C-alpha cells in the first residue's frame, strides 16, 4: 500500500481520534501519505475532493458505503471553575439559570441529550455559539459555561479533572454511531481498505 | 454593550487565544453574546457573514488593527526524537518526517534557515488543512512541524513538544490583526471587543 489518502472529518474527530492513531498507522504503512483535512458536512466527500469521510450522520439512499467505527454518548460538562463561581445544576430545569453554550449551526444540536422533568430533551438558549464542537470544548475548559458534547471529545478532560460531568442521571444513555463514508468505486484502492481496516480495529 | 458579535478565525487562533480570553470578556461584558466561528480565509468576512476576522494575512473598506507579533518554531515530540534522533542542522530535516499543509503551499517553506541562509522547503510526509491538526500529529509523534509560537509555546513549556534547530530558526515575526469593515466599527460591542483584544494580546 502506497500513495496519498485524503481523510475528511470534523475537527474533534481529527484531533482526538485520528491524530493520536496516525503515528501507529505510519509505522505499519510508512508508504501511505495521509492527508487529514477538516471541513463541514459531506460536500468534499460527495464532490469527490476527499477519498473518505469519518462522520456521525446517517446517509442512507445516497449510494455511499458506510462502515461503522464506534458509538458515542453525549455528556453535559462544565469546568470546576465555572461550577465554583456559578453553582452546580441539580436538575435540568436549572440550566435556564446557567450559561449554556451551543452551535451556530446545526441548531438541532442545541437540543441537548439531557432530559427534563417530563422526559423530553432540553432545548437551550445559547449564550455563546461556535461553529465547532472543538471550540465549545475550549470555551468550556476556560469556564464560559455548560456544554453538551460527544464523549470522545471530553472524556480525557473528565479523567484529568479539567471538566466535571453534570446531571448524569438526567443525561440520555442513547448512543450515536460514527461511520467511515466513501464511494464504492474508491474501495478498489488498497490504501483506503487498509486504513479502513485499521480504523475499525483501533476505534471499535 | 449588548447583542451578538461574530468572530471568525483559523482554528488555532480560536482555541489557543480567543477561547481562553472569552471568560474574562464575559465577566466584563456579560450582555455580549460571542459567536466564534472557524473557516478558511476571508470569505465569511468579505461576504459579511461575520463582524470581525482575526487573521495574519484587502477588498477595500477593510480596517486592520494589530493584535500581536509571532515567531515560528520547529518542534517534535520527545517520543519522536527518541526514536529518530534530533536534527543538528537544517539539512538533516531531509532524513526526518516533516508534516505540512495541504494548502497554502507557501506555508511549507519553513522559517528554518539552511547553511546558505535560505528558508527550508519541505516535502511533507503527511499533510493537513489546519495548523491545529499539525499540532496534534506532532504531539502524537508523527514528525516535525513548523508552527506559530502561540500554538505550541505552552506545550514547549509543559515539555510535551521540543524546540528544534533553535539557532537556525528565523527570529523574524509576522503580525496578526483584527480585520473588519469600516462601517462595522460604529458598533459598540465590536469596539469594546477590539479594545479588549489589543489590551490582552500584547
Ligand atoms: Cl463539530
Ligand atoms: Cl491554520
UniProtKB/Swiss-Prot annotation, chain B:
Superkingdom as given in the UniProt entry: Bacteria
Domain text: Each subunit contains an N-terminal DNA-binding domain, connected via a long linker helix to a C-terminal regulatory domain.
Function text: Regulatory protein that activates transcription of mdaB, encoding a NADPH:quinone oxidoreductase, and represses its own transcription. Under the same experimental conditions, no regulation of transcription of pilus and capsule genes is detected.
The protein's assembly and partners: Forms oligomers. Forms an octomeric ring-like structure in solution. May form hexadecamers when bound to target DNA.
Protein's name in the database: HTH-type transcriptional regulator CrgA
Lineage, opening ranks: Bacteria, Pseudomonadati, Pseudomonadota, Betaproteobacteria, Neisseriales
Alphabetic keyword roster: Activator, DNA-binding, Repressor, Transcription, Transcription regulation
Family as reported in the entry's similarity comment: Belongs to the LysR transcriptional regulatory family.
Keyword Transcription regulation applies: yes
Regulation of its function: Activation and repression activities are enhanced by the addition of alpha-methylene-gamma-butyrolactone (MBL), an inducer of NADPH:quinone oxidoreductase.
Single annotated GO MF: DNA-binding transcription factor activity
A GO BP entry: DNA-templated transcription
Interval of the full protein contained in this chain: 91 to 294 of 299
Induction behaviour: Negatively autoregulated.
Amino acid at each position: 500500500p502506497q500513495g496519498v489518502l485524503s481523510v475528511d472529518s470534523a475537527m474533534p474527530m481529527v484531533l482526538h481520534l485520528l491524530a493520536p492513531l496516525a503515528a501507529k498507522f505510519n509505522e505499519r504503512y510508512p508508504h501511505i501519505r495521509l492527508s487529514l483535512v477538516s471541513s463541514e458536512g459531506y460536500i468534499n466527500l460527495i464532490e469527490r475532493k476527499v477519498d473518505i469521510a469519518l462522520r456521525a450522520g446517517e446517509l442512507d439512499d445516497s449510494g455511499l458505503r458506510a462502515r461503522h467505527l464506534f458509538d458515542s454518548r453525549f455528556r453535559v460538562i462544565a469546568s470546576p471553575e465555572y461550577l465554583a463561581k456559578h453553582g452546580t445544576p441539580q436538575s435540568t430545569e436549572e440550566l435556564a439559570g446557567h450559561q449554556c453554550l451551543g452551535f451556530t449551526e446545526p441548531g438541532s444540536l442545541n437540543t441537548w441529550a439531557v432530559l427534563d422533568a417530563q422526559g423530553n430533551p432540553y432545548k437551550i438558549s445559547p449564550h455563546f455559539t461556535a461553529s465547532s464542537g472543538e471550540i465549545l470544548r475550549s470555551l468550556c475548559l476556560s469556564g464560559c459555561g455548560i456544554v453538551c458534547l460527544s464523549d470522545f471529545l471530553v472524556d480525557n478532560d473528565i479523567a484529568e479533572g479539567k471538566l466535571i460531568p453534570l446531571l448524569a442521571e438526567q443525561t440520555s444513555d442513547k448512543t450515536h454511531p460514527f461511520n467511515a463514508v466513501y464511494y464504492s468505486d474508491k474501495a478498489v484502492n488498497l490504501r483506503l481498505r487498509v486504513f479502513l481496516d485499521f480504523l475499525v480495529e483501533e476505534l471499535g
